[PDB]
Ligand binder design. Sequence first.
Ligand code: A63
Ligand code: ZN
Lengths: 47, 161
Amino acid sequence: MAHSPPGHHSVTGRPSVNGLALAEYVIYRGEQAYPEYLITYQIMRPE
Amino acid sequence: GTILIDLSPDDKEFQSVEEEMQSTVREHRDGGHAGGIFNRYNILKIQKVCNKKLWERYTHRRKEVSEENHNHANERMLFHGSPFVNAIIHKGFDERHAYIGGMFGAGIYFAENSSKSNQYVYGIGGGTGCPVHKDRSCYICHRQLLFCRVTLGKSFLQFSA
Ligand SMILES: COc1ccc(-c2cc(=O)c3ccccc3o2)cc1
Ligand SMILES: [Zn+2]
């Protein structure tokens, strides 16, 4: 695993082209996330 | 140490998690290649993941970060899709769950858009799709995502296509 940029705890990937996309995030320490919910699902075929 | 508690669909907690899942679907620039073609999900089950040791590991780190960032953990609830969801819920996130070739380097990646995390359920780029039908757009097979509590602390802003 890489390290956070010096003086930072994570990276935020801000979308700069696709106006509809939301942000993505990266952490470099597994202890910085807790898996709170497990969601079981199917994708639905559009009508 | 992990137990899974089913939420009732009548539980406000079920309903708020479902709403985050459904409301953050978007179209993707791959036309559905990785994750499939869909506008919404059929939610089959929502379970709370309970592990005291893993929770204490998280809160210990959260406090370290908070103390380095004017008492602000910058905590978010984000999605994570992975072939390793079963290991994660039992053993926690670690270096084995990192996206080695990710655009922001080898770390563990999370999304605001549930449909972005859906692209990774069967592997990077959707792998070969579901194990049963080898279909990245399988409408039959059950998929699993995590909705996770994530400490961002001071986050480095990368503007990107
Ligand atoms: C270990 O292989 C993996 C596992 C999960 C991911 C993963 C899971 C994500 O949910 C994700 C969200 C936004 C951007 C990239 C993402 O990547 C990537 C590689
Ligand atoms: Zn299938």
